A paper describes a structure:
The discovery of the bNAb [name].01, isolated from a chronically [name]-1-infected donor, identified the fusion peptide (FP) of the [name]-1 Env gp41 subunit as another specific target for broad immune recognition. A majority of [name].01’s total interactive surface area (55%) binds to solvent-exposed FP residues 512–519 at the N-terminus of gp41, while 26% of the surface co-recognizes glycan N88 on gp120. Structural analyses demonstrate that the improved paratope expands the FP binding groove to accommodate diverse FP sequences of different lengths while also recognizing the [name]-1 Env backbone.
Soluble IgG expression and characterization of these multi-mutant variants on the 20-virus panel revealed that 10 of the 28 multi-mutant variants achieved a neutralization breadth of 90% or more in the 20-virus panel, and the most improved multi-mutation variant [name].01_mm28, or mm28, used a total of three heavy chain substitutions from the template [name].01 to neutralize 100% of the 20 viruses in the panel (VH_E2K_A33P_T59F, or in Kabat numbering: VH_E2K_A33P_T58F). C Crystal structure of [name].01_mm28 bound to FP8v4 (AVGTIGAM) with (D) an enlarged surface view of the peptide binding region. F Superimposition of VRC-34.01_Combo1 bound to FP8v1 and [name].01-mm28 bound to FP8v4, demonstrating the broader binding cleft of mm28. Moreover, the larger bulk of the mutant proline side chain at position 33 in mm28 resulted in the Fab binding more surface area at the FP interface: 12.96 Å2 in mm28 as compared to 2.93 Å2 in Combo1. Structural comparison of mm28, Combo1, and their template [name].01 revealed three synergistic interactions that enabled mm28 to achieve enhanced breadth, including the accommodation of insertions in FP. A33P additionally contributed to affinity improvement between the antibody and trimer; the P33HC substitution in mm28 interacted repulsively with I515FP which allowed room for N52HC to generate hydrogen bonding with the carbonyl group in the backbone of I515FP (third and fourth columns).
Author numbering:
A (entry chain I): 512 to 519
B (entry chain B): 1 to 212
C (entry chain A): 2 to 52, 52A, 53 to 82, 82A, 82B, 82C, 83 to 100, 100A, ...
The structure:
C-alpha cells in the first residue's frame, strides 16, 4: 500500500 | 483517482438479521482495504483492515472478505449498536478514497404519523412574518409527503421540511414542515391545511385551522 | 488512545482556517496523521497525511497549493491550514491516526472528535424564539440565527422523553431555523408549566420561552 511519507 | 462503489446505499433490516454489504473497486486494490462504521454525530470507527482482519475490540459478529475489486462486509446478527453508516476505504494509491457509504436502518412495523398543526405566534406575527408548522410525529417508514393548502389552494411555493434520525427506542421518524408567509399574506386568508401522505395512512390525513 | 481537536470555526468566503489536533496516549511521532473532511450529509473526503516526525507530507491532488499540513512536536499537535475557503469547504474536519503496520497505510485507528468549519457570508445573529402552543403536543420555534449550533432542553433538563429537536434548516437568507417539540399527557397543560430553554452560544443568547395554551 501507499507509504511515501516515510518509515517510523 | 480510483472510485469505490458501495451497494446498496440504503438498507433496512431488523435486529437479528444477517446482512451483507458490498464494496466494488474501480481498480485492483489487492487486500489493501478497510471498513468503517459511523453513527450520526460521531467520527468513523475502524472495523476491518487488510480487507478481512478485525480491529481490536470489534465483536466477532463482524466479518469481511474480498479479493482485488470485490469486497463484502457481513454481520451475522444485527444489534441496536450495529445500525449506522458503513464506509469502505482503499489505500493502494493516492488519493485515498472512501466508498459512498451504506446506511443500515432498523426495520420495524409500519406506523402512521400523528399530525399536528401550529398557527403562528402573535409575537412572530407582530414581527412581520408568519410561520405555520406541521408536525408528523413517530412514523415508519421514512417517506412522508406533506402538502400545504392555504385557502384550499395548493401551495407549491416555499416551505421547508426537516426529518429527525431514527429514534433509539421507537425506531420511528419525525418530520416538521414550515410554511412561511408575510403578515399581510397570512392575514389575507383564513384556512390553513396540512395534507399528509404516508404508507400507514389508507387515505391521506388533513389537519387545518381557521383565523389569521 | 485519544486525539483532541480545536473548536468550531466560522469563516467568510476567501478566508483561511487553522484547525489543530493534539495526540494523547501514544507516541505522536510514531504514526502518520490523516486529515479527512465530511460535508453536511455527505461522505468522507481524504485531504492528505503527514509524517509528524519529519514533517513530510503528501497533500491530496485536488487540494495541493490550498491545504497545508504542519505540526509542532513539542506539544504533540498537528495543524491543518485550509486557505481560500468557499462554501464547498463547509463541513466537519477530522484528524485520524494510521496504524501504519509495515511502514505502510493500513487503516485509520484513532479519530478526533472533529472540527466544524462553516463558510458563509452571514453575520452572527441571535435566534428569535416563538411558542408553538397546541394527545397534546407543543414546542418551540428557534428562527433566524447564525451560526450553528443551538441547544434546546425542556424545563432545564427534567423533561426529556417525548422530545424531538429537529435538525436546523438553512434558509435563503443564509440564516438557520429549527423547531423543538414535545408530546405531553393529553391534559397536564393547566398544572404543569412547560418552558423550552434556548442557548445560542455564539451570540450569548439564552431565552426561556414559556409555552402556555
Amino acid at each position: 500500500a501507499v507509504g511515501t511519507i516515510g518509515a517510523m | 483517482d480510483i472510485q469505490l462503489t458501495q451497494s446498496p446505499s440504503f438498507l433496512s433490516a431488523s435486529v437479528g438479521d444477517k446482512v451483507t454489504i458490498t464494496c466494488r473497486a474501480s481498480q485492483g486494490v489487492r487486500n489493501e482495504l478497510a471498513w468503517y462504521q459511523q453513527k450520526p454525530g460521531k467520527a468513523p470507527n475502524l472495523l476491518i483492515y487488510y480487507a478481512s482482519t478485525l480491529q481490536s475490540g470489534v465483536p466477532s459478529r463482524f466479518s469481511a472478505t474480498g479479493s482485488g475489486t470485490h469486497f463484502t462486509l457481513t454481520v451475522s446478527s444485527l444489534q441496536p449498536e450495529d445500525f449506522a453508516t458503513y464506509f469502505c476505504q482503499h489505500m493502494s494509491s493516492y488519493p485515498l478514497t472512501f466508498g459512498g457509504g451504506t446506511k443500515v436502518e432498523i426495520k420495524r412495523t409500519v406506523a402512521a404519523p400523528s399530525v399536528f398543526i401550529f398557527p403562528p405566534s402573535d409575537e412572530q406575527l407582530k414581527s412581520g412574518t408568519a410561520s405555520v408548522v406541521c408536525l408528523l410525529n413517530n412514523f415508519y417508514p421514512r417517506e412522508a409527503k406533506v402538502q400545504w393548502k392555504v385557502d384550499n389552494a395548493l401551495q407549491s411555493g416555499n416551505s421547508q421540511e426537516s426529518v429527525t434520525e431514527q429514534d433509539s427506542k421507537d425506531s420511528t421518524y419525525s418530520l416538521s414542515s414550515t410554511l412561511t408567509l408575510s403578515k399581510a399574506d397570512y392575514e389575507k386568508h383564513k384556512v390553513y391545511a396540512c395534507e399528509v401522505t404516508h404508507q400507514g395512512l389508507s387515505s391521506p390525513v388533513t389537519k387545518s385551522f381557521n383565523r389569521g | 488512545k485519544v486525539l483532541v481537536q480545536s473548536g468550531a470555526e466560522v469563516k467568510k468566503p476567501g478566508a483561511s482556517v487553522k484547525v489543530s489536533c493534539r495526540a494523547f496516549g501514544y507516541t505522536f511521532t510514531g504514526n502518520p496523521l490523516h486529515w479527512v473532511r465530511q460535508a453536511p450529509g455527505q461522505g468522507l473526503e481524504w485531504l492528505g497525511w503527514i509524517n509528524p516526525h519529519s514533517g513530510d507530507t503528501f497533500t491530496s491532488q485536488k487540494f495541493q497549493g490550498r491545504v497545508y499540513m504542519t505540526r509542532d512536536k513539542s506539544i504533540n499537535t498537528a495543524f491543518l491550514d485550509v486557505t481560500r475557503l468557499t462554501s464547498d469547504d463547509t463541513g466537519i474536519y477530522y484528524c485520524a491516526r494510521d496504524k501504519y503496520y509495515g511502514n505502510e497505510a493500513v487503516g485509520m485507528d484513532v479519530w478526533g472528535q472533529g472540527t466544524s468549519v462553516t463558510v458563509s457570508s452571514a453575520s452572527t445573529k441571535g435566534p428569535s424564539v416563538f411558542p408553538l402552543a397546541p394527545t397534546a403536543a407543543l414546542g418551540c420555534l428557534v428562527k433566524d440565527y447564525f451560526p450553528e449550533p443551538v441547544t434546546v432542553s425542556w424545563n432545564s433538563g427534567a423533561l426529556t422523553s417525548g422530545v424531538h429537536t429537529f435538525p436546523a434548516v438553512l434558509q435563503s437568507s443564509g440564516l438557520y431555523s429549527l423547531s423543538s417539540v414535545v408530546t405531553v399527557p393529553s391534559s397536564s397543560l393547566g398544572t404543569q408549566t412547560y418552558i423550552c430553554n434556548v442557548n445560542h452560544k455564539p451570540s450569548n443568547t439564552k431565552v426561556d420561552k414559556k409555552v402556555e395554551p
